[PDB]
Amino acid sequence: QPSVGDAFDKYNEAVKVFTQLSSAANCDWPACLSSLSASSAACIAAIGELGLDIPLDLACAATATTSATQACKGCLW
Amino acid sequence: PSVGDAFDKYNEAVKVFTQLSSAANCDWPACLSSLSASSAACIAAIGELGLDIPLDLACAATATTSATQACKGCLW
């Protein structure tokens, strides 16, 4: 089988790349998260950390039907 | 789109991992409990019975090690 360890490494690398690029951008995570139309555990956790947890921000954003909100400019698109 | 492309690759890594986990005999709830990690991602992932793959991965990334038998097929 394809290595699940490698796939986990690639997940961690994708989070790192996003974290490096997102830190350099004009992202307001609490505003972005609140703008999302997302009812999910990931969003409860992400909003609960005031957007400070980038992995939870990403998991939350993936559960929303809308990602291209004005408040999420600089964060997700 | 700098962050937009990076978010797309994040989603691809999660989607690939999701399909790969089903084929690898992974017991996510057992794996999560074996990590003994009480980070926010882990509490949320455990409450979701391991069904939320993005939170499973975020939880695993907060653990000190993935070296448990319950995480064979999930993380190694």
Residue numbers in the entry:
A (entry chain B): 2 to 78
B (entry chain A): 3 to 78
Quote from the publication.
Crystals of Hc H88 and Pb03 Cbp1 homologs formed after a week and diffracted to 1.6 Å. The diffraction data from Hc H88 was resolved by molecular replacement using the Pb03 model. Using this model in the Phaser program in the Phenix crystallography programming suite, we obtained a TFZ score of 8.4 and an LLG score of 63.271, supporting the validity of the molecular replacement solution. The asymmetric unit for the Pb03 Cbp1 crystal contained a single dimer, whereas the asymmetric unit for the H88 crystal contained a dimer of dimers. An alignment of the two dimers of H88 Cbp1 structure gave a root mean squared deviation (RMSD) value of 0.755 Å, indicating the structure remains largely unchanged amongst the dimers. An alignment of the Pb03 and the Hc CBP1 dimers gave an RMSD of 1.6 Å, indicating the structures of the distinct homologs are conserved. The H88 structure was not as clearly polarized but did display a groove of strong negative charge on its C-terminal side. When the new structures were aligned against the G186AR NMR structure, the resulting RMSD value was 5.6 Å and 5.8 Å for Pb03 and H88 Cbp1, respectively, consistent with the NMR structure not being found by DALI and VAST searches of the crystal structures. Notably, when we modeled these residues on the Pb03 or H88 crystal structure, we found that the residues that were required for Cbp1 protein secretion were all facing inwards away from the protein surface, suggesting they are important for proper folding.
The most abundant virulence factor secreted by Hc yeast cells is Calcium Binding Protein 1 (Cbp1), which is absolutely required for macrophage lysis. For both Pb03 and H88 Cbp1, the three disulfide bonds present in each monomer orient the alpha helices so that the aromatic residues (Phe12, Phe19, Trp30) are packed in the interior of the protein, creating the hydrophobic core.
